[PDB]
């Protein structure tokens, strides 16, 4: 469809190894940054501690809670708490969850993220569900209790972005490479005896044509064709991270044309 060009190599519920082509490095890189820091998501951002006899401090547990990946499928149908016209929080802008655990058995009692319970009305939108990916349906191990120890909390999820705090980040890592063959000469290889022999060859060198001995430096060739690979943290489908990233960046660029308008 003319313009940017996607060419997926791998795909799954966790990673999207693809190949952006026919685009400026800037755009490629801008998208890379947006996926990392500006894609809306839901995450614990308030914890009320009623009972805590655990070996961990409140802020310690609180901190971890906020790091628990939460379902953010329909995150767009959840207003930012700072915008919402209510007082503090409500179902229109926040998801409330509870955690109640008691050291009953004699063996250590594990408090996972599955033990979290939504207490607010989700209104039918896929949101707030603690993400689970372990072959045991336990999820993230929040804390541990000895017989007698108790923990009664109340978390208030909220929509946020990574820029404000990494917890709100939907992405994990983002492989990024271009010109596996240093034809553009964007880098000067360090060596002892042999540049090529000492430097490991990249995966993407296969997906490209090795330079030819005689050909003089192609001083016009620019930087297009970037070999990426996104990895979702779970709060959002892998493909979504990309798509929504592309969309978010698109919004920013638009928020500026609108500024020129009312200017």
């Amino acid at each position: 469809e003319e313009g940017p060009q996607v060419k997926i190599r791998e795909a799954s519920k966790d990673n999207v190894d693809f190949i952006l082509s026919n685009v400026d490095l800037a755009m490629a890189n801008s998208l890379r940054r947006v996926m990392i820091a500006e894609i809306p998501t839901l995450a614990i951002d308030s914890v009320e501690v009623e009972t805590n006899t655990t070996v961990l401090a409140d802020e310690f547990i609180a901190h971890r809670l906020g790091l628990i990946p939460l379902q953010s499928m329909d995150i767009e149908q959840l207003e930012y708490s700072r915008d919402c016209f209510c007082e503090d929080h409500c179902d229109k802008c926040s998801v409330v969850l509870t955690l109640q655990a008691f050291g009953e058995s004699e063996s250590t009692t594990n408090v996972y993220s599955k033990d979290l319970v939504i207490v607010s009305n989700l209104m039918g939108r896929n949101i707030g569900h603690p993400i689970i990916q372990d072959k045991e349906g336990n999820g993230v191990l929040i804390c541990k209790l000895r017989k007698g120890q108790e923990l009664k909390l109340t978390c208030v999820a909220k929509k946020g972005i990574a820029k404000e705090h990494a917890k709100w980040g939907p992405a994990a890592a983002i492989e990024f490479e271009y010109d596996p063959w240093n034809k553009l000469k964007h880098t000067d290889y360090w060596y002892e005896q042999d540049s090529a022999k000492e430097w490991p060859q990249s995966k993407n060198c296969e997906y490209e044509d090795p330079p030819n001995e005689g050909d003089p430096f192609d001083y016009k060739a620019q930087a297009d064709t970037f070999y990426m690979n996104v990895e979702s943290v779970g709060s959002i489908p892998v493909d979504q991270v990309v798509v929504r990233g592309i969309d978010t960046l698109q919004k920013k660029v638009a928020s500026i044309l609108l500024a020129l308008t009312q200017m």
């Binding site: 070996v55 961990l56 310690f60 971890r64 790091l67 628990i68 990946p69 250590t108 996972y112 993220s113 993400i131 689970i132 990916q133 372990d134 072959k135 045991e136 336990n138 999820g139 993230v140 191990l141 804390c143 541990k144 209790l145 000895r146 990494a166 917890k167 980040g169 992405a171 994990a172 890592a173 990895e231 943290v233 779970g234």
Partner: protein, 65 residues
């Protein structure tokens, strides 16, 4: 204290693989390296996260008060 929820460097959820790492060692008698790799942890930043953890809560739990 306990398995950090995410890896400091990339954020990849790692705080949901402690018990698995442990079993992969005792029950399956696998070596640390071969174990972390089977947990999807390929980049040394995530690998170190688990391989270097110290589950001090176990000893903490050993107190009564």
């Amino acid at each position: 204290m306990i398995v950090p929820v995410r890896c400091f460097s990339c954020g990849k959820v790692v705080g949901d693989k402690w018990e698995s790492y442990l079993n992969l060692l005792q029950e399956d008698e696998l070596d640390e390296g071969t174990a972390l790799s089977r947990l999807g942890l390929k980049r040394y930043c995530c690998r170190r996260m688990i391989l270097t953890h110290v589950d001090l809560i176990e000893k903490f739990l050993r107190y009564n008060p």
